[PDB]
Amino acid sequence: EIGTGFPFDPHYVEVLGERMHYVDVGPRDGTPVLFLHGNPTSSYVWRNIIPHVAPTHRCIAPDLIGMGKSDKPDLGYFFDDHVRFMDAFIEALGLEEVVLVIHDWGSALGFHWAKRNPERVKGIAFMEFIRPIPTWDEWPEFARETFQAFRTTDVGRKLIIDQNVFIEGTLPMGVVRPLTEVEMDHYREPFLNPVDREPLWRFPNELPIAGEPANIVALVEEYMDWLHQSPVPKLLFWGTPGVLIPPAEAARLAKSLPNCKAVDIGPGLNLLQEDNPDLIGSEIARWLSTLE
Ligand SMILES: [Cl-]
Structure with missing residues (x-):
């Protein structure tokens, strides 16, 4: 059975006058x-x-600002807010060179950082990552009405903030196997108070879809141009049918991204981590092995 426990001792660091939680394990x-x-x-x-x-x-695993066990400041929780706090989280920890393991909005932060700091990245493992979505036709059919409703100051906030539909609906629906009530309760924890759900609603509004928002779309094209031209070692996890990265996209990227290996996890949607953690783990470990 896939583990439901979060046993990790907390770590905390002051970043821009707020406290951010992170896991720290290993030598x-x-x-x-x-x-x-x-x-x-x-x-x-x-x-x-x-x-x-x-x-x-x-292994260092921060909770983004507003999320997990990190503080909950009074921000709009824009992408740019995340860039500011993650830039400072890495400097706050005195990291020189890193390997990145990144997903969804974490891949936006990771690729934006790696583009700005090429010399400090020894490798990027990534999955279900943000690229520009030129029209709604490139967004998966099944997700299309959901995300179109999320991108309204009236209907979106009713679903995500009032009803918490991102946690109760969108989240478990991004997993092929059924999340257990214990798993749901961990993901529920940060967001028991409705006013603390602002980042849950902002992010979908920041997705680079049919040219908007303009600024995110530009930012993401730039890190994609960089990723396509970087020689940094790359490891791409993909599943069938995926959401943000369909198999066809994965195969093209496997072939075109320099120095990139691809690992099929099997049945997979958005949260590949919840479907085949053991293979994601062991492939990352084995890929780290040979970066030496
Ligand atoms: Cl989102």
Whole structure:
């Protein structure tokens, strides 16, 4: 059975006058592995993956601002707010060189950072990552009406903020196997208070879809141009049928991205971590092996 426990001792660091939570496990005598979650997860999404990596590499898994066990400041929780706090989280921890393990909005933060800091990235493992969605036709059919409603200051806030539909609906529906009530309760925890749900609603409004928002669309094209031209070692997890990365997209990228390996996880949607953690773990560990 896939583990439901989050046993990890808390760590805290002051970043821009707020306290951010993170997991820190593993030896301090090598290159650290920075795991970045997306919406609407936390470090909890990495709980069954980090045990495969910890024995050889230090594993750092922050909760983005507003999320997991990090403070809940009074921000709009824009993408740019996340960039500011994650930039400072890495400097706050004195990291020089890192390997990145990134997903969804974590892949936006990771690829934006890697583009700005090429010389400090020794590898990127990624899955179900943000690329520009030129029209709604490129967004999956089944997700199309949901996300169109989310992108309204009236209907979106009713669903996500008042009813918490991102947690109760969107989240478990991004997983092929059924999440257990214990799993749901971990993902529920940060967001028991409705006013604390602002980041859950902002992010979908920040997705780069049919040219808007303009600024995110530009930011994401730039890190894609960089990713396409970087020689950095790359490891892409994909599943069938996926959501943000269909199999066809994965195969093209496997072939075109320099120095990139692809690992089919099997049946998979958005949260690949919840469907085959053991393989994601062991492939990351084995891929770290040979970066030496
Ligand atoms: Cl989102």
